[PDB]
Amino acid sequence: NHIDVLINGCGIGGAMLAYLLGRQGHRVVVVEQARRERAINGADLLKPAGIRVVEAAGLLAEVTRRGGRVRHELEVYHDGELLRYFNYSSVDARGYFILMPCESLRRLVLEKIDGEATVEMLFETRIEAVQRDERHAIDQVRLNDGRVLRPRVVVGADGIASYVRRRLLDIDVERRPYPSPMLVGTFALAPCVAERNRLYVDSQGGLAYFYPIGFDRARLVVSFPREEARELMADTRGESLRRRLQRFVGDESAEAIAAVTGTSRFKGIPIGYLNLDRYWADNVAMLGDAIHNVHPITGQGMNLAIEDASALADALDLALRDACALEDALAGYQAERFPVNQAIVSYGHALATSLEDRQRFAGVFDT
Ligand SMILES: Cc1cc2nc3c(=O)[nH]c(=O)nc-3n(C[C@H](O)[C@H](O)[C@H](O)COP(=O)(O)OP(=O)(O)OC[C@H]3O[C@@H](n4cnc5c(N)ncnc54)[C@H](O)[C@@H]3O)c2cc1C
Ligand SMILES: Nc1ccccc1C(=O)CC(=O)O
């Protein structure tokens, strides 16, 4: 019943890790509490560092074949006037980003895992209990199907409310909510949205970000102070939201506003602030939202899960092929990822708290 790696969670992070380890013939069991087909919804953005992972995994061609869109521009408006235009390819030819729904990319990765004979995905399954040895390493894990496994490594890829973090590592994280929630809705695609990503903010705390997703749809991500957000979502025919948008979204995006036909299909987006001091202990390591939570205004939640998965796959491959001890590989993982994750967590908070103040917001961008 010896395996190399037990991964708790089959989100984008855990799926990517499973796939990269499986490609090397490592014996992997992935435990996921949900059904495989549970349509989750998540982040839509891949940044250059995430794209590098997807490309190295051999998946980049397939991403655009399945509705992923290459982009290299963003317009940012404040109080209806253009504050910044960013052209990410204006120095770096490979500066581009990709818009790809998390669930589409995850389905692609699962299709690859289906072809890897050393990886076993267990859906509608959870860990029940673990047993530690005299060195304090997890050596036996019992699942709620009664299966017992003996993994060399246990990974928490189990997201924002990580079971591994809370129940195996005994970490409690301080909750510090933001006063403005964020919501995302999917609408018909207007030509203006097809043309260029446009982010709008105003001095009263409003945010509206319009961008295309898949072949023939568009997202609108909004943020308002909580009580206002409540009132705008309550008028379900969308008239209050559309008129609030018209206060800070100019006519370039008028057709995108008109596409907002109601509010009933908006979904909340979680908003945390976290970067754990330790990404690992003993033979247990964590990735993605289990270890950090970035403000979703950064767009980077999926991207950082993928970057972490790739780093952790590198570290675990070294340890499992006996190129170094596990504790040294896990320390190297943390050395590599902690600074990157820390910068984006700090930057997300700096963006979210500067929105209303035009000069400060611009200053956060310039870095
Ligand atoms: C609707 C929505 C919109 C979002 N939009 C944005 C955005 O605009 N910008 C942004 O930066 N981020 C956004 N996010 C956050 C982003 O998707 C996450 O950062 C990303 O999914 C993290 O990936 P992960 O693999 O670490 O965790 P997840 O994708 O959360 O995957 C974790 C997996 O673990 C499983 N799991 C949990 N507990 C257990 C258990 N006990 N046993 C077994 N399995 C378990 C879950 O079922 C899940 O499949 C959004 C999230 C949502 C839901
Ligand atoms: N990148 C962003 C910038 C401002 C507001 C929201 C987002 C996102 O929410 C993108 C995503 O869905 O990953």
Author numbering: 4 to 370
Q: Would you copy out the relevant sentences from the publication that reported this structure?
A:
Crystallization experiments with wild-type PqsL produced crystals of very high quality. This allowed us to solve the three-dimensional structure of the enzyme bound to FAD and its substrate 2-ABA at 1.8 Å resolution. We therefore focused our analysis on the specific properties of PqsL’s catalytic site where a molecule of 2-ABA could be located based on the electron density map. 2-ABA occupies a large cavity above the edge of the flavin ring. Specifically, 2-ABA interacts with the main chain atoms of two active-site loops (residues 46–48 and 300–303) and its carboxylate group H-bonds to the backbone nitrogen of Asp47 and a water molecule. A critical observation was that the substrate aromatic ring is oriented with its amino group pointing away from the flavin. This binding orientation cannot sustain catalysis because the amino group must be in reach of the terminal oxygen of the flavin-hydroperoxide intermediate. A simple 180° flipping rotation around the C1–C4 axis of the aromatic ring would position the amino group of the 2-ABA substrate toward the flavin, in the position expected for amine hydroxylation. The crystallized 2-ABA-stabilized oxidized PqsL could therefore be the dominant enzyme-substrate-inhibitor complex, with a KD of 38.44 ± 3.98 µM. By comparison with the pHBH crystal structures, the flavin in PqsL can be described as in the OUT conformation. The shift of this loop, caused by a kink at the Cα of Tyr276, positions Pro273 of PqsL (Pro267 in pHBH) in direct contact with the flavin, which thereby remains more buried within the protein compared to pHBH.
In this study, we show that the catalytic activity of the flavoprotein monooxygenase (FPMO) PqsL can be triggered by blue-light illumination. The enzyme is involved in the biosynthesis of 2-alkyl-4-hydroxyquinoline N-oxides (AQNO) in the opportunistic pathogen Pseudomonas aeruginosa. It is homologous to group A FPMOs13 and has a relatively high similarity to p-hydroxybenzoate hydroxylase (pHBH), the most thoroughly studied FPMO14. In contrast, PqsL catalyzes the hydroxylation of an aromatic-amine group, a rather uncommon reaction, and remarkably shows no intrinsic catalytic activity with NAD(P)H as cosubstrate.
